[PDB]
Amino acid sequence: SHYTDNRYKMMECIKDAGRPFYPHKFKISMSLPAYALKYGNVENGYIDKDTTLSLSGRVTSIRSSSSKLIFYDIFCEEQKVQIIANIMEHDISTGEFSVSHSEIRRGDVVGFTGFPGKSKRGELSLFSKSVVLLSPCYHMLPTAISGLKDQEVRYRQRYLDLMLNEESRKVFKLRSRAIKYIRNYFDRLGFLEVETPMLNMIYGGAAARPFITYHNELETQLYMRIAPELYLKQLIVGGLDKVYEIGKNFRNEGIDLTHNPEFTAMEFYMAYADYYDLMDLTEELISGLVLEIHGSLKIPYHPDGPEGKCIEIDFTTPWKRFSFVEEIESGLGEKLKRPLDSQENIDFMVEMCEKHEIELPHPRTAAKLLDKLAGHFVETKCTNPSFIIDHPQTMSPLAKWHREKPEMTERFELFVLGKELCNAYTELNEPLQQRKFFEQQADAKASGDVEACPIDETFCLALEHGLPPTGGWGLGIDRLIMFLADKNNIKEVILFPAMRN
Amino acid sequence: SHYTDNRYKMMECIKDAGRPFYPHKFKISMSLPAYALKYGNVENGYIDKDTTLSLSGRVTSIRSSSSKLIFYDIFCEEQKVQIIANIMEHDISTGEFSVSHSEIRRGDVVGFTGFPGKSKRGELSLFSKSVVLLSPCYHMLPTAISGLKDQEVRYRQRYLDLMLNEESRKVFKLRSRAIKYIRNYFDRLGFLEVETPMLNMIYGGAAARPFITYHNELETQLYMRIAPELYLKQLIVGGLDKVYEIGKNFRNEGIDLTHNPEFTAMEFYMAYADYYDLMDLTEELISGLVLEIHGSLKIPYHPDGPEGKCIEIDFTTPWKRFSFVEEIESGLGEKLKRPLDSQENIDFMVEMCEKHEIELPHPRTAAKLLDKLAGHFVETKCTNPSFIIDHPQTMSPLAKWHREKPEMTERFELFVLGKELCNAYTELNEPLQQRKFFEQQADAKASGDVEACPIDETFCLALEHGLPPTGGWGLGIDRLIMFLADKNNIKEVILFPAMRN
């Protein structure tokens, strides 16, 4: 803290002496990338004293070869430029040379004015006549993220990570590029991007515990959305035909290294599509995105970090399909009992979970037990992108009954390395069944399933106005970034992730 | 209503009789717009019996001239097509003609197969051979939104508005087009789009009361954001140079025709800009968007609805500037007392609010009093887009002190027709002052100012790492759409606005 208090003392001295104190505006002549572009191929030793330029960035290096010569590195917009400050060139009307430069520290934001060219040793340089302190750094910075107190500083103080660590800047640029690619894919198909409410008197459309809030003037409990699905289907009733939404969902659950209370999701709804159409689209969209980002469909992934084992993920299309129940039964060496939601089958699934050392869910609903079995026996087969298809109705209250398989729905999930990326189905559009599945959901919630949702009467009424046959789909954008950028925890792909206090 | 009950009984009859019941997949040959493009110019009476096509849409009309000849209109993706169903073309493998058509009602989503062409009277038609009920409508629909019970039905059941009313569909395509324009403008300048948290252990960056929630596992209270500003500025400390975010902010306040609990806002931050640069950018961005949508810079506005008076809004640049204090003082006929936040000026502004019958704020802070006076004397002058500039520091805790004007800041608001559209300033980047102004905001909060924010220690520490000279800017997208679309309430430009009950 001595360095910080000393810096406040310096700045007070600068202000009281009438020297530059946080200048409002510094007019650069060009960006540092442009400067490297215009001068990065001059002859060694070239200097143009007929051109005075102004540059600015953050100081990353200060070296004094002598009391008369000082070398700076400044960094801005991914470009480093060296500043050579020779006392012979200094503008005395800005102060004596030693005074001007004694106010500068590594980490400061500074401006320089001078002549362009390259040093005799060949370094792109500005031969400076002056230096302005634009915004001082009051703390001693490390030279790299290795010198941070610990690597959680990167998440709690993300500006330090971005300032010092090119890899972190790269991730969030890639994140923006990937989302651009996705919007363009759907815009070219004639989709309409929409926004639906994040605050509602009800929640639904996913299996998640919601955040609860309160509107004081309405005196009403509200929920933050867990998914936009039910609103988006109303827009298809309304005739908009192809809609998508990219935004935050909120889940009130565990904050570990791979779960964040808010996450970025996309959904789209396409009238007259079924889940087979959506499989084809998923493959085209995601393989095209991987090809765009990586230049091939085979990309590395390091589950235990960059010095650990590497798995090469192959996105070559088409992808493997695993049928939900059949693959469980192949793993068990026994068939599930029918109906899948009978007490007989619930008891059987409990027994199978205990036999295979699968953690039991609470409460022990057929749907939650089926999910545990799928997690053990099927998700574990999904190394390369793989579709798990035809989920039981009992775990898929909004998915339409399978046109051929009793008790199943026209649903798929996309898994990569055993992690869920997409969830999609032929949409249930028959209001009697929809109401019945909502009632079974509400019973699960009353029995202690914090992930079951209440009945939504406004959605049932919308279905009574005629939802066309429709296919809908969701994508977890954060998990997708994790694979594309090869990061093994979600805190790497979210600028300001939640952290335990 | 007997209609809904009867329709449910019809569908149960259909299901039990093995007749088509919510088909999973209907494969259209082409969209109705594509159909009109291909066949819209054939001769009257043309029919191509060598081509069989499948079309689908929602039934908007059923008419007939005998038991043998039925006429439908179907509507889909903004295009109407007439279907001519002659018993002599009926495919009996789908049932008897009279039975197949007895199942169809106005409002149903239906499919047809048949031959393309035009009736002798010149109507684009499909000469059908079959009809499929895809998703029935269980309610009797009006033919236009005028037949709705009330016009709050348009907002509470938006699918009915979208289904019946072309003007509502136009609004939301316009909204998408405008947001697309804004992204492209900033993408071309090299900006990076980012996402920052909507859930925080603190709130800040705007004047608004927040929604409060709770994270159960972390056992900690959270706030929904009122603005992303404090996170976005950390990204500039981090070196990202040019960032923007387009997302929801949340305000826990009154719900009415112009106030929604959530609204769509944009912010951007640009290193090395000042508020003068931001005024020029606002003019360029907004006038170019107006030009893109309207074809000129002079656009109509109907503050009392479409048959009422029409105002012309003139976006020709440069726009009028009003200086905050000077214009208040011109309206008063006398000067405010200095310092503006002295008890003397607080007493004086209370007296002025009383004399001019201005509703007093609570509490009676200098900032809220200054805001009441500016709303009365200055915002009312802002018909055409106009900048109110140089706000007092006492109401601008995050804006940098004005380089020429004591007590003022380098801030502007953009007003159109007396309503705020933008808020922007040269960013305060001096940490001592920033802490002082945060404490002042905390004191307002403790005195009952539900719109003042608590001190953010994480942000103060971020400024201690050096925020470059920076300009930041926010835009209320909903208000913008209201003007661009000539709508006089916010419920018209939000798909699912919050409503009473």
Ligand SMILES: N[C@@H](CCCC[NH3+])C(=O)O
């Ligand atoms: N709402 C789903 C995504 C879309 C499912 C198909 N309608 C989810 O959160 O997983």
Ligand SMILES: N[C@@H](CCCC[NH3+])C(=O)O
């Ligand atoms: N946070 C401001 C917009 C940005 C102002 C300039 N930093 C608002 O909500 O009005």
